Structure formats: structure tokens, C-alpha cells
């Protein structure tokens, strides 16, 4: 029986994987970070409040210059803010008011948004006509489009409900490579700072590290039990972090190929909506469903300095590229920038 | 104000943007989202288009203007993905309209349609994501039900029926009861109806139904329930 032989071989391959992982575990992170200086009580305060949305804010993303800020709301609108002076730069209406995520392209020219319409739209900001219009409508997914991120002027990565990610070439309008290998829906995505590799976690408790050019699954991380719905690399791109409905964030290592550390509160039984790292990667800032937003010490796994300023669930967050300020956006239609 | 020239112009442009936002909010803040559901190619889209005619994988959105309120029927569900992490956009919806085709009985792949449809129905009515939303139920196409009663007995596929061979009213009552029982131990108000092509009243009931739904939440917020 070929099927039985293949299943057996996969089984002893899994056993070899487990043996290797155990062998390399000569310590844990908390066994070596016990003798490091703690951060201490650091409190950040709301410096601006970006208001103008009407319904919940679903996702947001800082531009590369770290000033501009694109946020997509249930209102069927994207709003491109100026986080220094709170002035709205652009307001983009949508063809389909069902938007789940957004993306500000690194060149600052294009903004990507997608959602239940199964399509990633690429709005062009810097045009003669002074308005902002779709330049491409990337279709080719079958399931619902969770999170799309840019790589350059022409290559955008998307992750959808097909249980698949795609590497779309915007100028031509067709996917170059499709990354398959998940089982659940690919609920989150994240790019390496050097953009050689990306990563994605799915509604099967597993995360997978993808190669952009080779298109084959480099490695897979397990350890979560509920849906991984937030990912953001450690700033050097050799580590990795996820947040799931386990009331838990986890930090994995891309070279140790195993869990590295966990962050959790027992009294918390609610899920996590978005994570991110600071510029030094010392702080794992994570939103939560209890309307708060914690700032974990991403190395000692011990801090509860909470960015508590929202009247409903903190949906999305991030840090500026140069790290001056974090930003959050919650279901109360407000984006609060903290520093 | 220490703002330079272009900064003042930028503030003016942002005020214009906020003006357009307020104008669109003037209709956005009074809109209700009612998630429309169904399975078996029963024609949920056709039924919504029929309401659009009666009174003034894809998503089709149908506005209704009822009694100085804007309802907006959302028609989605052609996708086969793992909808749990995609129904998050509908975590708090006013109501969940579920259309069923009463002609499905003793009509199949290899399995009769209502067993699959009602499994889907109970799966939706029991999600923890939808606990605060009432469930409305629209049993469409009853004339063909009458036609099929001249042919098919209910016991021909579902043995637990009891009644006369051609008692159409008994058939409607049993099927509606069948769909009601799958409501779990939770005290969720499951609405019901039987519609027809000339049923110019059925649209009203959706409004009526939503009314009660909101009313319920209000009483559920004041601990009067």
C-alpha cells in the first residue's frame, strides 16, 4: 500500500523532527534571560487621536517614512492620515465596502486594500488627476482575502481563504507563484525586513515560513492551539512572533526552528488581535480583546504596562519604521498614536 | 496659530474631507446589516431581487428603505472556505436571515437537500460568534410544495412525519417545527415565515422582526428579561 508507506515515512520523519528539536534544546530562553536588566515601568501616552471614521477600524499600516498612516474601516473607506498633524491626507471610497486589511506600499505610491470581495485592489495615490483610483484589481483568489503586504512597486504578497498565499505581480495582474501547504485559512502575514522570506499563520494553529523566490515551504512552527491571527518579525528577521486565541503570544526562532518563549496572563481568556515589535525588538506590543493593549517585554516575558485608552476592542496596531511612536486602532473608530 | 501657509491649506482640505465623511455618515449611521444565508441553489439571490421588485462566489447588496430607515441585505455565501475566520466582519449583526426551499423534500449528489441545509442551519444558529443576533427564517416557494404534495409524501424520505397523505398545512407546520427544534438550549428567538411571489407583506415582517430584535437587546440591556 503506497498510501500507508508514505504515511509511515512521514511518521518517522516527524519523529526525527521531534528528536532533533529535543536534542537542540539545551536551555530555554527564560533560563538565560533571568540575569538581564529588566526594562522597568515605562508608560506611553496618547499623543494624537485620529477621528473621522464612523464604524470599526479593521487594520492599519504605517508608510515607510513613518509619518503617513493608512487605515481601513468598516465604513467602506480607507483614510490616509498625517500622524504628525492629524490632518487627513486622502479619503478613498471603496468599490465594495467589505474591507478587512490594508497596506501602504514602501515607495509611498500605492495603497492596497482587500476583503470579502475576494479581490486585492491597488489604489494609486500619486497621479496627475489629483484623485486616487484603482490601478489594478487583483483577482484570482477563491476564498476571502485576509492580509496583503507589499514588496516593491510591482510585487505584492496576499493571503486568502483559499488556505493559500500568492505573490502577485501588479503590473501584469497575475500571480507569479502560489504558496500552498496550509490547512486552515491564512489569517495573517508578515515580511522579513530584507524581504527575502515572509511568513504566515493560519486557522489551523500553525505558522509557516515561506520563501519568495523559491516558493517552497522552508519550515513550519506548531505549539499554538487556537487560530494564529497576528504575526510580525523580530526586527533582525531571524526570529518571529505570533498571537492566537490562546490568550497567548509566542516567540519562535527561525534558526532554532522551535518555540522560544511564551507570553500569557492566566486571568486573560480572550484572544489577541495584532502584535508587533519595537525597533530594538525588546518589546512585543500586542493588542487584546479585553479592549486593552499590553506591552510585553519581548525578552524577559514580564511586563504589564498597558496602552489602555480604547472604549472597545483594539483591532490593529504597529510601530513606526524608525520607532518613534506606536499606533493602535480599535473598534471605537479612533486611531490613537502612543509615544 | 503658528501654521505656515500650506499647513493652513492642509487643514482646510482635511475639513473638506471631514465634511464629505459627515455627509456619507448621514446615511451610514442609520444602516443595519442583515446577513442573508442559504444553501442548495435554492435561489436566495432571486428572492432578494423579488423583494427589490416588489417595493423599492460573490457579494450582492440590496438596500431597502422601510419607514424612514435604511436596511441593507448582504448576500454572500458562494464561498466554501472555513467561514469562521471570515464571518468576523459579521461578529455583531442585527439579524441572520436564513432562506430554505420547501420544495427540497424528497429531492437530492446522493443525499436529500434539507438534511444538509438544516445541518448548515444549526451550525450557524449555534456559532458563539452570533449569540447576540436573532435568526430569521424564510421558507420560500410553497406553491411547488403544494404541487409536490399531489405527488410525494413526507414519510417517503423523513419517516418521523405524521399526518394525512396530502395535508399541505401539516407539511408546512411540521417543516417549520423541524427547523425550530434545532434551536439549542439557549433562549434565542427564532422567527419564521412562509413567503410567496405575491406576498407583498413578507418584506414588512423583516422590518417587524428587526424591530423586535432591537427591542429585545434593549430589554436585555436594562435587565427587564
Amino acid at each position, epitope marked *: 500500500s503506497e498510501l500507508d508507506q508514505l504515511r509511515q515515512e512521514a511518521e518517522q520523519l516527524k519523529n526525527q523532527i521531534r528528536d532533533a528539536r529535543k536534542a537542540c534544546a539545551d536551555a530555554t530562553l527564560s533560563q538565560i534571560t533571568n540575569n538581564i536588566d529588566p526594562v522597568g515601568r515605562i508608560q506611553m501616552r496618547t499623543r494624537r487621536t485620529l477621528r473621522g471614521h464612523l464604524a470599526k477600524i479593521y487594520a492599519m499600516h504605517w508608510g515607510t517614512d513613518s*509619518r*503617513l498612516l493608512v487605515s481601513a474601516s468598516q465604513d467602506g473607506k480607507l483614510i490616509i492620515w*498625517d500622524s504628525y498633524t492629524t*490632518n487627513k*491626507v*486622502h479619503a478613498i471610497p471603496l468599490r465594495s465596502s467589505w474591507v478587512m486589511t490594508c497596506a501602504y506600499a514602501p515607495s*509611498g505610491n500605492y495603497v492596497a486594500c482587500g476583503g470579502l470581495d475576494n479581490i486585492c485592489s491597488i489604489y494609486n495615490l*500619486k497621479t*496627475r*488627476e*489629483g*484623485n486616487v483610483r484603482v490601478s489594478r484589481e487583483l483577482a484570482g483568489h477563491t476564498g476571502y482575502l485576509s492580509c496583503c503586504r507589499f514588496l516593491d512597486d510591482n510585487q505584492i504578497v496576499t493571503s486568502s481563504g483559499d488556505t493559500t498565499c500568492a505573490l502577485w505581480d501588479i503590473e501584469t495582474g497575475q500571480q507569479t507563484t502560489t504558496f500552498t501547504g496550509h490547512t486552515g485559512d491564512v489569517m495573517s502575514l508578515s515580511l522579513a525586513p530584507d524581504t527575502r522570506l515572509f511568513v504566515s499563520g493560519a486557522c489551523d494553529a500553525s505558522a509557516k515560513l515561506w520563501d519568495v523566490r523559491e516558493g517552497m515551504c522552508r519550515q513550519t512552527f506548531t505549539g499554538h492551539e487556537s487560530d494564529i491571527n497576528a504575526i510580525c518579525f523580530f526586527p533582525n528577521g531571524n526570529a518571529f512572533a505570533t498571537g492566537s486565541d490562546d490568550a497567548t503570544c509566542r516567540l519562535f526562532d527561525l534558526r532554532a526552528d522551535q518555540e522560544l518563549m511564551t507570553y500569557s496572563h492566566d486571568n486573560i481568556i480572550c484572544g489577541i488581535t495584532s502584535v508587533s515589535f519595537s525597533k530594538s525588538g525588546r518589546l512585543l506590543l500586542a493588542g487584546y480583546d479585553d479592549f486593552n493593549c499590553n506591552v510585553w517585554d519581548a525578552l524577559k516575558a514580564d511586563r504589564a504596562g498597558v496602552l489602555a485608552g480604547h472604549d472597545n476592542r483594539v483591532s490593529c496596531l504597529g510601530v513606526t519604521d524608525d520607532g518613534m511612536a506606536v499606533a493602535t486602532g480599535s473598534w471605537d473608530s479612533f486611531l490613537k498614536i502612543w509615544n | 496659530c*503658528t501654521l*505656515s*501657509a*500650506e*499647513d493652513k*491649506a*492642509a487643514v*482646510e*482640505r482635511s*475639513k*473638506m474631507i471631514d465634511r464629505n465623511l459627515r455627509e456619507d455618515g448621514e446615511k451610514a449611521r442609520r444602516e443595519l446589516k442583515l446577513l442573508l444565508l442559504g444553501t442548495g441553489e435554492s435561489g436566495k439571490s432571486t428572492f432578494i431581487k423579488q423583494m427589490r421588485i416588489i417595493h423599492g462566489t460573490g457579494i450582492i447588496e440590496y438596500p431597502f428603505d422601510l419607514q424612514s430607515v435604511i436596511f441593507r441585505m448582504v448576500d454572500v455565501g458562494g464561498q466554501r472556505s472555513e467561514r469562521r475566520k471570515w464571518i468576523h466582519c459579521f461578529e455583531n449583526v442585527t439579524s441572520i436571515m436564513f432562506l430554505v426551499a420547501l420544495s427540497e423534500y424528497d429531492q437530492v449528489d446522493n443525499e436529500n437537500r434539507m438534511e444538509e441545509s438544516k445541518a448548515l442551519f444549526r451550525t450557524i444558529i449555534t456559532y458563539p460568534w452570533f449569540q447576540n443576533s436573532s435568526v430569521i427564517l424564510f421558507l420560500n416557494k410553497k406553491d411547488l410544495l403544494e404541487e409536490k404534495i399531489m405527488y410525494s409524501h413526507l414519510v417517503d424520505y423523513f419517516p418521523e412525519y405524521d399526518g394525512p397523505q396530502r395535508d399541505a398545512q401539516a407539511a408546512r407546520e411540521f417543516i417549520l417545527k423541524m427547523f425550530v427544534d434545532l434551536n439549542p438550549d439557549s433562549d434565542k428567538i427564532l422567527y419564521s415565515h412562509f413567503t410567496c411571489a405575491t406576498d407583498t407583506e413578507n418584506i414588512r415582517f423583516v422590518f417587524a422582526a428587526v424591530k423586535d430584535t432591537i427591542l429585545q437587546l434593549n430589554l436585555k440591556e436594562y435587565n427587564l428579561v
Partner: single-chain antibody, 236 residues
Framework: DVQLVESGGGLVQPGGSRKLSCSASGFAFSSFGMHWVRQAPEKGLEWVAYISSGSGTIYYADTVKGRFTISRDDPKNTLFLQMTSLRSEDTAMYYC??????????????WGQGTTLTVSSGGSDIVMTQATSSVPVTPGESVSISCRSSKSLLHSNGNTYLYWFLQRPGQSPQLLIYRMSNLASGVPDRFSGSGSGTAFTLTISRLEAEDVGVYYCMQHLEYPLTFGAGTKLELK
């Protein structure tokens, strides 16, 4: 490409009244503010009027305040400038000028083709100075032009509101460099900006015969926008 066409260039006896029309075709006119700029026969561009988006605010130069009128027709996408009591000191070409202001914008980017208005029978603002009036140029050489200001335009937030415009013989001015270092769309990378404070520098390397023209400094700190006399580059 975008398009603006003006009209109403009648020839009138002094003190009369006129109307000038700037029909816009090829962009969302309702989102752009507009200016009106003026050019005397042998002088430099001078600023005349400004009407913001949606007619929220309006500004006029001191030489014209209370004497000119300006208006926008959004549904018809047209700009009007109505003249009453025109002096003989207004016989000039008029350029309707586009302008959009937001973070990273490019004001004054596109200009109308201009219309002639021949009629025959201040202080506590910024003034720009042109160290020269013309520069001798063999093509292919690297040269530069220097502007000076009475007030340092480098505002508190780090912006420097200085623009540089080129006017080829027989065409409207086109925007070369906005905010003293940022070049506009379609501008070859030959041009660049330099300086600071009160001394501003336009440096051009590998000059092309197509780049011969007249260069102008706009300050844009104060709504009494003051152009420089500008220098005419000539071919040798």
C-alpha cells in the same frame, strides 16, 4: 495629460470691466485650489489671486484687493476672474494655475496656456532678489542660479517653502522644484536644489539646449506670494 484653457482676453479702454475664464478638462477640479498669476510684457510673474478648494478661503495681493473678484463653478469645472476698473498697469498675460496642498503635494504643478488682457488709451511681505539677470551658457555645462530672501523661509517644522519655475520662450511656466529640494513629475534628474535659510540655489548639471529659459523663485510662506524677477538663461 491635463488641460486648462483660458478665454476672455478682450481689448478694453481703461477703467472698464472684463471676465476671464479658465475651463478645466482632465482632472478632478473640485479638489484643487486655483490661483491666478500675471505677467507684464517685460517683467516677471506677479501673483494676483487665490481661491481655495470649495471656495473656503480667498486671498488677494494688496495691489488688487477689493478691485478684482474670483469664483469657481464646480459642476461646470470652470474658474472666473472678474475685473472692474482695470488700470493700464494690468495689460498682461494671465495664467490660471492649479494647486493642491497636502503632505507631499506639488503645488503650482500645472499651468494654463494664458490669455492676453491689453488695456490702453505694500510692505511687510517678502521680496526675492536675483544676484544676476542672465548667465552666459555653452550647452553641456554645469551652472547654477542663486535666489535671496529677506526672511528665512525655512519654517519651524522643517519645511522650506521655496519653489522654482521654468519658462521656456513661448510657453507657460512649468514647475521645476518644490520645497527647495523636491523635483516635480516629468523633471529630468539634471536639476537639483541647495542652500538654506535666506540663500537658495538651483543647480543644473549637463545643461541641455531644451533647458534654455527663464527661471523664477516663488516663496510660499506668505499668501502675498512674491515671485522673483528671475534670470533669463541664453544660448552661446
Amino acid at each position: 495629460d491635463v488641460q486648462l484653457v483660458e478665454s476672455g482676453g478682450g481689448l478694453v479702454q481703461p477703467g472698464g470691466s472684463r471676465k476671464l475664464s479658465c475651463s478645466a478638462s482632465g482632472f478632478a477640479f473640485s479638489s484643487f485650489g486655483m490661483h491666478w498669476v500675471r505677467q507684464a510684457p517685460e517683467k516677471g510673474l506677479e501673483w494676483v489671486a487665490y481661491i481655495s478648494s470649495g471656495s473656503g478661503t480667498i486671498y488677494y495681493a494688496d495691489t488688487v484687493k477689493g478691485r478684482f473678484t474670483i469664483s469657481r463653478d464646480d459642476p461646470k469645472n470652470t474658474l472666473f476672474l472678474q475685473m472692474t476698473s482695470l488700470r493700464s498697469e494690468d495689460t498682461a498675460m494671465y495664467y490660471c494655475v492649479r494647486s493642491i496642498y497636502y503632505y507631499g503635494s506639488s503645488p503650482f504643478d500645472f499651468w494654463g496656456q494664458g490669455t492676453t488682457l491689453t488695456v490702453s488709451s505694500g510692505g511687510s511681505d517678502i521680496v526675492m532678489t536675483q544676484a544676476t539677470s542672465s548667465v552666459p551658457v555653452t550647452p553641456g555645462e554645469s551652472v547654477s542660479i542663486s535666489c535671496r530672501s529677506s526672511k528665512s523661509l525655512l519654517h519651524s517644522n522643517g519645511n522650506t517653502y521655496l519653489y522654482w519655475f521654468l519658462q521656456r520662450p513661448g510657453q507657460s511656466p512649468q514647475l521645476l522644484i518644490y520645497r527647495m529640494s523636491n523635483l516635480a513629475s516629468g523633471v529630468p534628474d539634471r536639476f537639483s536644489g541647495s542652500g538654506s535659510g535666506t540663500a537658495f540655489t538651483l543647480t543644473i548639471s549637463r545643461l541641455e539646449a531644451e533647458d534654455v529659459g527663464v527661471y523664477y523663485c516663488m516663496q510660499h510662506l506668505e499668501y502675498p506670494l512674491t515671485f522673483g524677477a528671475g534670470t533669463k538663461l541664453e544660448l552661446k
